[PDB]
């Protein structure tokens, strides 16, 4: 059932797209000290799953914030500073975001080849016997 | 009894439905950049049953960027590719029904 492959590779296409949009939100909010929801932004990350028990689709089960502590900065005159004079910034690390951008983009493209190659195997199957 | 409804089976209706599904996916890809457009799908099981005996909205995987458009372009390409493959199979099945039907009435 090569159509099941389209359910697997296609699921990875969406899964790797979520991780790319997750990376973009982390890159754009690496210097944002304020927020609209009154909680400082934290590096978000997607969670992949595999319900192994033939074809096992990959599904994102939710976005989870990083466990690293917030990066504190001594800004005593900032309006949002605390008693000790520190403001808190998101715990986004540049190096890991670049690796995620490289890994997610390459993972997205390698599933196109499988979905494209599995397409050809189906077309030749229709041609069998004639 | 010998009739086309019993000889062709459901393949006479399946071909038509997948053509409609092609249009539905095609109008989703074109309206990808139009703000306020909601991607619409077609339920193959329900549409086939209606044709035999006789436009839902797709949920977004992620929130829209702000335009109001819920068309996921990479999903549309994947769905259009699968629909085109099965449409060719439907033509192969339905076309072979006539050819085997002609062979019987002609004897060779």
């Amino acid at each position: 059932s090569l159509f099941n492959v389209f359910n697997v590779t296609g699921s990875a296409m969406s899964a790797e797209s979520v991780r790319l949009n997750t990376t973009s939100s982390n890159l754009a909010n690496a210097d944002s000290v304020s927020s609209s929801a009154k909680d400082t932004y934290k590096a978000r990350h997607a969670v992949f799953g595999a319900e192994l028990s033939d074809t096992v689709p990959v599904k994102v089960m939710g976005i989870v914030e990083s466990d690293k502590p917030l990066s504190a900065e001594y800004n005593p005159d900032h309006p949002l500073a605390n008693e000790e004079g520190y403001i808190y910034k998101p715990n986004v690390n540049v190096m890991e975001e670049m690796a995620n951008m490289i890994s997610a983009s390459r993972a997205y493209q390698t599933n196109v080849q499988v979905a494209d190659s599995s397409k050809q195997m189906l077309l030749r199957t229709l041609q069998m016997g004639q | 009894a010998i009739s086309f409804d019993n000889a062709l089976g459901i393949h006479q209706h399946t071909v038509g439905v997948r053509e409609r599904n092609a249009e539905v996916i095609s109008t989703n890809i074109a309206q990808a950049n139009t703000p306020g457009y909601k991607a619409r799908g077609l339920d193959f099981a329900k549409e086939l049953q209606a044709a035999t005996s006789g436009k839902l909205y797709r949920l977004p995987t992620q929130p829209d960027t702000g335009d109001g458009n819920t068309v996921d372009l990479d999903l549309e390409r994947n769905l259009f590719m699968q629909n085109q493959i099965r449409h060719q199979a439907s033509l192969d099945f339905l076309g072979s029904k006539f050819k085997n039907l002609t062979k019987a009435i002609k004897g060779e």
Binding site: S36 | Y57, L59
Partner: peptide, 20 residues
């Protein structure tokens, strides 16, 4: 995907979530 019978709503991007 998960075809529903009612159109999905538009995402809201507020500068302050209280003013929503």
């Amino acid at each position: 995907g998960a075809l529903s019978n009612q159109p999905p709503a538009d995402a809201s991007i507020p500068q302050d979530v209280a003013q929503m």
